[PDB]
From a paper:
Bacterial homologous lysine and arginine decarboxylases play major roles in the acid stress response, physiology, antibiotic resistance and virulence. Inducible AAT-fold basic amino acid decarboxylases (LAOdcs) have been studied since the early 1940s1,2 because of the link between their enterobacterial pathogenicity in humans and their ability to overcome the aggressive pH environments and oxygen limitation in our gastrointestinal tract. These enzymes decarboxylate either Lysine (LdcI, also called CadA), Arginine (Adc or [name]) or Ornithine (OdcI or SpeF) into corresponding polyamines while consuming protons and producing CO2, thereby buffering the bacterial cytosol and the extracellular medium to promote bacterial survival under acid stress conditions. Here we show that the Adc from a multidrug-resistant human pathogen [name] massively polymerises into filaments whose cryo-EM structure reveals pronounced differences between Adc and LdcI assembly mechanisms. Like all proteobacterial LAOdcs, the [name] Adc monomer is organized in three different structural parts.
Moreover, as we observed [name] Adc by cryo-EM with the goal to solve the structure of the decamer presented above, we discovered that most of the Adc double rings were linearly stacked to create double-rings and longer filaments. Consequently, we solved the structure of the [name] Adc stacks at pH 6.5 that was used for protein purification to a resolution of 2.15 Å. The atomic model of the decamer stack reveals that upon polymerisation the conformation of the Adc decamer remains extremely similar, with minor changes localised to interfaces between monomers and dimers, and at the interface between decamers. The inter-decamer interface is mainly stabilised by a salt bridge between D472 and R492, both located in the AAT domain and respectively situated in a loop following helix α18 and in a β-hairpin. Remarkably, D472 and R492 are replaced by G472 and T492 respectively in the solved structures of E. coli and Salmonella Typhimurium Adcs, providing an explanation for the inability of these enzymes to polymerise. We note that the isoelectric point of the decamer shifts to 6 upon stacking, in line with the burial of acidic residues at the stack interface. Specifically, although the diameters of the LdcI and Adc decamers are very similar, the height of the Adc decameric ring is 105 Å compared to the 90 Å height of the LdcI decamer. This height difference, resulting in a 95 Å repeat distance between successive [name] Adc stacked decamers compared to 76 Å in the LdcI stacks, is caused by an inserted β-hairpin in Adc, which contains the stack-forming residue R492, as well as by an approximately 10° rotation in the wing domain.
Residue numbers in the entry:
A (entry chain G): 1 to 190
B (entry chain T), C (entry chain O): 1 to 755
The structure:
Amino acid sequence: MRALIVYTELTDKDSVISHAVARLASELNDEHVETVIIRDFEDGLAYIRSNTSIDCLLYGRDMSDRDEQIQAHRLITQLHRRQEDVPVFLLSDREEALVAFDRNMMEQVDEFAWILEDSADFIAGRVLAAIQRYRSQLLPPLMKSLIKYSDVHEYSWAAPGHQGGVGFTKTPAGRIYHDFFGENLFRTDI
Amino acid sequence: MRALIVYTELTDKDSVISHAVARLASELNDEHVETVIIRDFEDGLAYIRSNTSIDCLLYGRDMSDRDEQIQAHRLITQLHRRQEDVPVFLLSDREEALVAFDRNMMEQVDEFAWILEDSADFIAGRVLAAIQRYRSQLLPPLMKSLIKYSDVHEYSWAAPGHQGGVGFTKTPAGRIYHDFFGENLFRTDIGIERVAVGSLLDHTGAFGECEKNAARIFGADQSYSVVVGTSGSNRTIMQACMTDDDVVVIDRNCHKSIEQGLILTGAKPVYMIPSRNRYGIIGPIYPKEMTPDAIKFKIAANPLTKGKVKQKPAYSVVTNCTYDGVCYNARKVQDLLDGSLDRIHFDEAWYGYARFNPLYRNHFAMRDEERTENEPTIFATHSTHKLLNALSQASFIHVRNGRNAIDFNRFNQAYLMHSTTSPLYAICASNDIAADMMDGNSGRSLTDEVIRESIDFRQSLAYLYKEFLNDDEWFFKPWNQEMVKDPATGKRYAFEDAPVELLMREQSCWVMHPEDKWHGFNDIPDNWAMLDPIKVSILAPGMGDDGKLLDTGVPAALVTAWLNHYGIVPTRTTDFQIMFLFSMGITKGKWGTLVNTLLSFKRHYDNNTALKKVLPEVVASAPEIYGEMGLRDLGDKMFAYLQKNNPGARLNQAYSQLPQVMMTPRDAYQQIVANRVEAVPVDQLMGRVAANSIIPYPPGIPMLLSGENFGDENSPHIHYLRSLQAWDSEFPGFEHETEGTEIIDGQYYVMCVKT
Amino acid sequence: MRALIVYTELTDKDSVISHAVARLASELNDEHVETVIIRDFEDGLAYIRSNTSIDCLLYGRDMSDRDEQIQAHRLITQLHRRQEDVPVFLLSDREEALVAFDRNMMEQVDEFAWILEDSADFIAGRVLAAIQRYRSQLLPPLMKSLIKYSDVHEYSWAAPGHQGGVGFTKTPAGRIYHDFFGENLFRTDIGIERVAVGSLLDHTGAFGECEKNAARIFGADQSYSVVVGTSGSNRTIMQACMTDDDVVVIDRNCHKSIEQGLILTGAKPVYMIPSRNRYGIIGPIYPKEMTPDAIKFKIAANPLTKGKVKQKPAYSVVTNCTYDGVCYNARKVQDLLDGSLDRIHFDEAWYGYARFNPLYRNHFAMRDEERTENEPTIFATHSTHKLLNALSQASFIHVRNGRNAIDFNRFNQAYLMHSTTSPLYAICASNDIAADMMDGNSGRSLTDEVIRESIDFRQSLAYLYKEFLNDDEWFFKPWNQEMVKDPATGKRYAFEDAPVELLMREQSCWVMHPEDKWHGFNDIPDNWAMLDPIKVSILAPGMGDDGKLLDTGVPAALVTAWLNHYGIVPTRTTDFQIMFLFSMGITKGKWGTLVNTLLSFKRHYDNNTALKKVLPEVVASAPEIYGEMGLRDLGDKMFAYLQKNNPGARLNQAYSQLPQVMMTPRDAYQQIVANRVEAVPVDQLMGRVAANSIIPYPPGIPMLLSGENFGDENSPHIHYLRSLQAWDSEFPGFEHETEGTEIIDGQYYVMCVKT
């Protein structure tokens, strides 16, 4: 689980939003969500264009700058090009977000995170729930069912004879072959 | 122990104050006080608004800047909103603080710390002493005594048998259960024979202290903690109040525990009929039903009570607020009922927070008001687990003694009659912590947070509705005022454009005015009812303002199926109405998920997405019907069915006319005990007397009570039951719930008295 | 996951098997299975007898030694006593195991592990699969579903308001409370609207599964889980059974919930009077009170029921076992009452384990027996928190359908009438885990452990009593048989010399025989009653076998004060009797503390130690009286008072004669509701009707019920109340408890019906 945080300047003084984001990142790391913190939308765009899996996007902008609004929309569109249903959290001061609220905002924002008046634990829990929801719909059906069944290791009394690759690990050459191709390939040959 | 240090610029050169603060922080850490150092008051405010426990605040400012003075005062006020008695230390140069010394300074400063001329060890010791003093007063009495006793681990030679959870740790399944629930839960299950804590049923010790504290906090003369919920509380109040030789005035919008009390007391009930609107939402009882002449007329017309027209009614019950958030003006209700009764019971099961926010002023039972000596006795029941923070089955009885009051010795008999001899002390502890949570500034702060969240959701939904309407599209709309008026300046706003402070402060922005069309309660008097902001109803399109359906619409059953598929479970639902609860357990900005879910439903509805892709569980009910069918196809099918059958008129007919009463509820139940009852299908209900209550959903309030006749062939009640059955047959997976019926092979059966 | 490896000598040279086992243990640790390696079967037995969870047993022996075979079988049987389905792997050389292969081997071996010719990885994988299979079947259904659902953390938009405990973590006191009780308790408080788990009141889902499982385990046709304790269970049973037009047969040794049921139903009660002994211990009802002629005579003699002599009684209740551990032969009681009634209710609140130990055979309600079709309907109520392992308020209703049975639809009305709409699921989960704990081998093993501990205490106390008697000194003695007879060989033993196996196996060692003097129930039939071993009564000296006091003695009130000072709180107490509870939560050898405390009391009593040194709390009551007074001085003062006043005769007079009945308990309570009651002092009680029940301690059972006359000047009941008041006045700090009275300035007041 990896969360990407892209915020530029939410408060007139940087330290407030920086400390709030640091607290949120600590709470996310305590629940085993890795966090990447980025201060510029072009840097975030470059990060997204690297084929790195992102499970959640949390972003905030100036909220009074239309250029940063365009940049944020570009970032979210780029993210959804290849990672289509990744949850997007808006990090913002509540009043600024509420005055900017409209249909176009909700077209790209899935959840609100009032970073300056909410506990980092509550936001981290909501982020984790969103990440789990996203991960549960990610795989296509056959691949999902095969992965789910692959954990079974019991000896069936039927073919194939290698029985999830166990048969190969009885001669040294078979063991080399089994280690080369890996266990999961043989455990899906069911 | 955590100390928060907020200082900005105390010296012209930063290094002096920074080094002094560093020395103080080191000395505080050496005494195991964690320190958070913050250089800006806005950062400190953000830190305080995170629900982190702070045991001491040490702050310093420029001391010559009035803006920083205002900021520091704001920080301290914010801290004391939810952490009321946290000590505040002023860090300052001595001369600067002394020249600024006044009453206003001492109102917010508890101690002085001359950080530049005092040893950090002395200040750290004083801080630790202050923290210990603060921590020693933090817990409410029952919880404190339970925690203190929990350290005892010796085997008592008495019940409970598990002996602080030791008994569970003897089988593997017991060990898993014990590890899951934790040790402290079992170590507080100590029985009623430990004099260190006291006993709940005797109201002694910490239990007596907790009940006195709760009575003070909730503004009652006496309070009783209950471990059988508001069902139990209602039963004991009704048992203490009435007898089988009594006539009582019952809100027809009554919980089933009220009918249980009627069965257990044998009293003869007379009913006040609440109002209804075009959405099927049950509204308030109008004042025309509570007048002394109306009550005398009801008593004289009732078949069972017509020989008691000279007898003063012994008890009345009004549900406030209602299930859909309609709050009575309780002062006016009490004044109306004072002309006929000496005992008024307000069943405020969903309404426990009302005392602690000024928005609800005059709309609840235990008001801060000058009390005269000729008032009636007032009872209020709170389900502390519903909209306060308590475990299930926790409840309170609040009593204000007036005319014909019941003294403690008499009331205790009913209390014991509906209680248990072995209460679980965790439930009472949750009651105590809930009362403590509403005490002082914290109750106001928590109610404010919930109200603000609900208002943000309502305004956002209204804005989206207007946007979609401007694009000539449909959307959901919140059920509140369309336009609000500022009573000070006279300025009018659209609801979504109104300032949040105005909606949070002004009660008239939520009062049901007779000239407004939004609420739909025709002929309601002004300043009679009010909408609770935190019970948010949303309306699906399809119902016209006149009361008849439009040409197109989206039935709420399909939206409910969508929400259930996404895990959201509404509290109430009608044909076009979905109710969402905002509680003190909600987190800020959570309603964005609700808005997102509604928008995605609208997208899939406009796209006519196949039910197999979006709602597989709906398809799994009747795969031959819902297979190869889209979301909008099903929606239009349901709306066409509603247009053809018009079940709203059926509901109005069934609930505008009361059923004929044949016997008291106790007599009907004793027919059950005597085995003189049978299961009767709906088509054979004509002339039959129901053995138990029939509560259809919607509207969720009883259509028939025990001992009431179903009526002849043209009876609206049998017609409404038939309508619900027909809907269930036509739409599998969207079946209505009806308490008091048995559904065999999809057919309704009702237990009726054998003729 | 923990695997236990027990191997002694598999190969002629130890290093081969040791290295193979080391490789296997390394492979098991690499898959996160902890391993305990033991080289001796006695060490493995000791390890198993420690309550440590074992997920798999891998063992090997010599395979040519029959002694090691017996030891291994013993080890596996011991393991499955409390860990029933743990997989067992046989570690062996292949040929040795194959030559020893038979049915008896396969009865205890689940899998083979050829440790000397198989890879440790293959065996480790098979062990892990077996462990996972075992763990997946370990939990009972409701607990399993609750644990599975507990991982959900999303904000539902419905009650409870705390939303999995989030609401508590918003004030500092709430955070302390939340951390104390832990997260999992609040995350299981989910409400009745989560279909993944089901609903308790609808008996659907995991709740239906749990109730079916409990009915199977306890041998009932149907079982109901109750969250209002046995008080609630008794109320719902009585509400389902009787009506105000009914006559009922009530054990005079009844809990106050039985009288509450009488008040709530309005039935007319007739009473069976239990027996008493010289110590004031209430004994069983004799068969002469349950015969059809006796019941007809009681009905014909009762002032209220004499117009119902042709009516079959609708309900009877018998408390079994009693508070002092007297257990009826329930088969004989049922056969006696079958001639008059169709419904028998056994209130087994203290008697829930009885089904699971053969020592209690035929002495409980839900017996494993061939059932005919003409049996009466049997109800049994268990307080699962009393002598089973459950949280307070957990209870069960068990039904065996017979004549005039109540079907589910009719019974559910009473069940809902005495329940709450928001049950706390932790209580139901505790009920489910208690039922699971009694299931299979574990119930027998746990009851055996408790019974053996109680027998060890009884025998040690009897031995010490004999030793002190031989030294012509006084001591406490257990209340059981002095001499026991072995029914097989005919050999007689003194109780302290009897083999423990005989006392644990033979029921006749605990039956009350009419020829024995220990129990003191004169004219009791043989094979009628039986003593529960785990309810241990000890007798202080002072009472003669004839029924009159001796020249000297030690009153039990002083011993009770001593025990309270040391933290031990007895369950019951009379003038010379102290009752101690042995429960499944006791640990082995704990009764040594009790013996030590009694010995130290005897030392300080013989030394006449000043009460200030030993019992400062006693002195703090009346420092002018107890100051400068010794332990033996106070004891002799109390004994002289008892000798002069003889309150035991007062108790016998008060309880041998029943008070005159003036009205039903419901009528008396409705006098309270009508405010027609007053507080009356004891000296003015002549001719007055009690408004509530009077329960003096001793004997702890009601002397008067509601609606019963106190009597004239010479009434024994007023005399007994006066005796208790006089004792309270003479000995501050040793005051009797009397439910149903108010003590103002040390004077007794009783609520009575205004004439």
